[PDB]
């Protein structure tokens, strides 16, 4: 079992609030293909049969 267990910040009763800050740019990701179109084909009926 290796699931969930996410990082959790602690809520502060005091007016000042602890905030997690990013330190590394780590730019870059990939994106899924969206299909967009389907193949076109024509069948010659009454001849192929």
């Amino acid at each position: 079992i290796a699931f969930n267990h996410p990082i959790q910040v602690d809520q502060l009763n005091s007016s000042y609030f602890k905030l997690s800050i990013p330190t590394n740019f780590s730019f870059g990701v990939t994106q899924e293909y969206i299909q967009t179109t389907i193949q076109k084909v024509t069948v010659d009926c009454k001849q192929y049969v």
Binding site: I7, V9, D10, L12, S15, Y16, F17, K18, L19, S20, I21, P22, T23, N24, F25, S26, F27, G28, V29, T30, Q31, E32, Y33, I34, Q35, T36, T37, I38, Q39
Partner: protein, 98 residues
């Protein structure tokens, strides 16, 4: 075109996206910022003043750690101009907006 906003691109901040021809379709290459390391820093929720103008959160928290520090990067101050910060009416817990 822009996304710079909520968009179909997901799992990362949409700084930019790229389109390439794909067989029977279109292929996308969005770019996403990843924080990687998070450091928890105590932040004031705005600072009030004896004068009516008061420090307030604008691009990011007005005080990242103390006084006026505004940045999303590791360095809290980052030479912030503070021009962006608005000046709202004094609120509860005086001398602080909080």
């Amino acid at each position: 075109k822009a996304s710079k906003r909520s968009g179909f691109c997901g799992q990362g901040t949409h700084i930019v996206s790229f389109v390439v021809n794909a067989p029977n379709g279109l292929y996308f290459m969005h770019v996403g910022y990843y924080p990687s390391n998070h450091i928890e820093v105590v932040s004031a929720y705005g600072l009030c003043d004896a004068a009516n103008p008061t420090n307030c959160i604008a691009p990011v928290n007005g005080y990242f750690i103390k006084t006026n520090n505004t940045r999303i990067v590791d360095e809290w101050s980052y030479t912030g101009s503070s021009f962006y910060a608005p000046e709202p009416i004094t609120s509860l817990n005086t001398k602080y907006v909080a």
